[PDB]
Amino acid sequence: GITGTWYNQLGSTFIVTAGADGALTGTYESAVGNAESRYVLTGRYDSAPATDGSGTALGWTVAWKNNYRNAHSATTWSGQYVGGAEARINTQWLLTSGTTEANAWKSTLVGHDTFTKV
Amino acid sequence: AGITGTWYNQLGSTFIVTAGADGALTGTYESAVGNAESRYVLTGRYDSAPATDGSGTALGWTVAWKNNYRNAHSATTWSGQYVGGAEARINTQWLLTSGTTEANAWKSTLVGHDTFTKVKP
Amino acid sequence: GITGTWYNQLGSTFIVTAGADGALTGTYESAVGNAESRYVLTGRYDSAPATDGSGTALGWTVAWKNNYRNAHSATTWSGQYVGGAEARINTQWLLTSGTTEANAWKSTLVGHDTFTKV
Amino acid sequence: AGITGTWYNQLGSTFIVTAGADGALTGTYESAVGNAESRYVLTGRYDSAPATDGSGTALGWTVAWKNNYRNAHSATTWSGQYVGGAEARINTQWLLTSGTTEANAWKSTLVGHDTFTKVKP
Numbered sequence: 001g002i003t004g005t006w007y008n009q010l011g012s013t014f015i016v017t018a019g020a021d022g023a024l025t026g027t028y029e030s031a032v033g034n035a036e037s038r039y040v041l042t043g044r045y046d047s048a049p050a051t052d053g054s055g056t057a058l059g060w061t062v063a064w065k066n067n068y069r070n071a072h073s074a075t076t077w078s079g080q081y082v083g084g085a086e087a088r089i090n091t092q093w094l095l096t097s098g099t100t101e102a103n104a105w106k107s108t109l110v111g112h113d114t115f116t117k118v
Numbered sequence: 119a120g121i122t123g124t125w126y127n128q129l130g131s132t133f134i135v136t137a138g139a140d141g142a143l144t145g146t147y148e149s150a151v152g153n154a155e156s157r158y159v160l161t162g163r164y165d166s167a168p169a170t171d172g173s174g175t176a177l178g179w180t181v182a183w184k185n186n187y188r189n190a191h192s193a194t195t196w197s198g199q200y201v202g203g204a205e206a207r208i209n210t211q212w213l214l215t216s217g218t219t220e221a222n223a224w225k226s227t228l229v230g231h232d233t234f235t236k237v238k239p
Numbered sequence: 240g241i242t243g244t245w246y247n248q249l250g251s252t253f254i255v256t257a258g259a260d261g262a263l264t265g266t267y268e269s270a271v272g273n274a275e276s277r278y279v280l281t282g283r284y285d286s287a288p289a290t291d292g293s294g295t296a297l298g299w300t301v302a303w304k305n306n307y308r309n310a311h312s313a314t315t316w317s318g319q320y321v322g323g324a325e326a327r328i329n330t331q332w333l334l335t336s337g338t339t340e341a342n343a344w345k346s347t348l349v350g351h352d353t354f355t356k357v
Numbered sequence: 358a359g360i361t362g363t364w365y366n367q368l369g370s371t372f373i374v375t376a377g378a379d380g381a382l383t384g385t386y387e388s389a390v391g392n393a394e395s396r397y398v399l400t401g402r403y404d405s406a407p408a409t410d411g412s413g414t415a416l417g418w419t420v421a422w423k424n425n426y427r428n429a430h431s432a433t434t435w436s437g438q439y440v441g442g443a444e445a446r447i448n449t450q451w452l453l454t455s456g457t458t459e460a461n462a463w464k465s466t467l468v469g470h471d472t473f474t475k476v477k478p
């Protein structure tokens with residue numbers, strides 16, 4: 001279910017492969033920010049979720065550096081997968097930028113992305 | 119190189135990591151607190167080409183709390199930066215999400231911050 | 240514009256009064272959690288926003304204690320007001336619970352609420 | 358009572374506050390960093406009836422960065438707890454939102470954490 005191509009409210013493209021062992025692998029393409037084309041991503045997820053109606057926790061990282069640019073920063077998405085007729089992945093993220101110790105106080109942005117397969 | 123090694127945070131948790139030349143991070147994490155025991159696999163990414171100034175190196179990693187002994191049905195992601203030198207440090211802020219029913223979703227995510235100190239290998 | 244009765248995706252009721260000086264005052268009633276009836280709230284907002292198309296930053300707090308219960312915790316909402324045909328207040332919150340120093344690591348929840356007048 | 362007084366965080370910022378018996382917090386804040394100068398009004402709320410155990414006192418306050426000298430078109434909210442005793446502390450986590458256009462909304466909110474130390478009044 002998790003495996004596939006997903007899109008968030010901003011129009012970004014998330015392409016993941018979920019291994020049976022609990023690994024997440026794929027590429028991420030952002031529709032906004034100091035970025036172009038695809039970026040490697042790696043993460044983990046609960047490969048044995050609860051039997052009740054709970055979602056399956058997951059999380060991945062993306063360092064914003066590839067062959068075209070280096071924004072000198074990383075983003076981590078933490079959230080949960082909810083299956084069904086209209087599957088979705090609701091997350092919250094932390095975008096940290098490399099900074100001098102003097103600007104460390106304003107180095108981390110926080111947001112929330114919702115991904116669907118549409 | 120700098121990032122690679124054994125680190126510990128203020129909680130007494132252990133962070134063993136290796137930085138690949140492609141910007142990949144792999145290793146194991148051991149939490150001193152929470153519903154967890156033994157080692158859990160971790161995977162992340164970092165800026166393999168930081169600015170040559172006094173800036174830190176942005177990085178991040180995830181850890182799904184499930185191994186061959188326990189499953190907490192949750193995942194934590196650490197987002198922060200590495201700061202080298204004599205006293206190398208990794209200052210991070212994290213998000214720990216628990217799997218929940220639709221009704222309890224609003225209280226599924228905890229937020230915190232850990233500071234890691236590296237041990238002379 | 241900010242003044243009025245708002246509702247979030249959870250069904251909670253937010254009733255605010257925005258003073259000309261930049262003060263926020265009102266009551267908050269949550270549809271979920273260890274809470275019942277109304278709770279006092281106080282906050283601040285930019286009473287002189289930018290002339291471009293920017294939203295107006297705002298933020299308020301609610302200690303979860305009233306005549307009926309005391310959940311021993313506080314919530315702060317930080318976000319921005321966007322006027323127009325369909326006004327809304329998009330926010331992100333931090334819910335801190337009073338805890339022993341040993342549980343301090345898991346004392347703060349983080350989320351995001353969207354309020355509309357519907 | 359405990360909370361009331363002058364406090365400072367690791368950045369060198371000043372936090373003057375008074376705790377009302379109704380659970381209200383009022384005072385002024387002075388930031389050591391950012392687009393700010395002089396004092397800004399603050400308002401918050403706290404648990405005026407904490408648990409008699411070793412628990413902390415939950416509290417929170419907002420500060421819109423606008424006074425008679427500057428307007429940064431932003432607001433910060435601090436959420437945390439007070440911990441009394443010999444060395445009283447206020448450990449918090451904050452959210453600073455900037456007013457932005459619809460297009461830049463995604464990068465409107467910064468997240469951090471401040472620790473406040475009280476000064477013997």
Ligand SMILES: O=C(O)CCC[C@@H]1SC[C@@H]2NC(=O)N[C@@H]21
Nearest residue numbers: 012030033034035064071073075
């Ligand atoms: O400036 C950069 O480094 C690019 C930031 C991209 C960010 S990550 C969180 C948000 N979600 C998304 O799909 N794109 C933006």
Ligand SMILES: O=C(O)CCC[C@@H]1SC[C@@H]2NC(=O)N[C@@H]21
Nearest residue numbers: 131149152153154183190192194
């Ligand atoms: O899932 C659980 O119950 C274990 C949570 C462990 C958490 S992750 C953030 C925090 N840092 C750490 O070293 N340990 C705790």
Ligand SMILES: O=C(O)CCC[C@@H]1SC[C@@H]2NC(=O)N[C@@H]21
Nearest residue numbers: 251269272273274303310312314
């Ligand atoms: O258990 C409690 O203290 C009540 C928590 C209520 C929380 S505040 C963030 C979320 N938004 C809302 O409208 N209700 C919930």
Ligand SMILES: O=C(O)CCC[C@@H]1SC[C@@H]2NC(=O)N[C@@H]21
Nearest residue numbers: 370388391392393422429431433
């Ligand atoms: O709006 C601005 O540019 C000023 C931001 C000041 C921020 S609020 C969180 C942080 N703590 C503090 O004492 N100062 C900074």
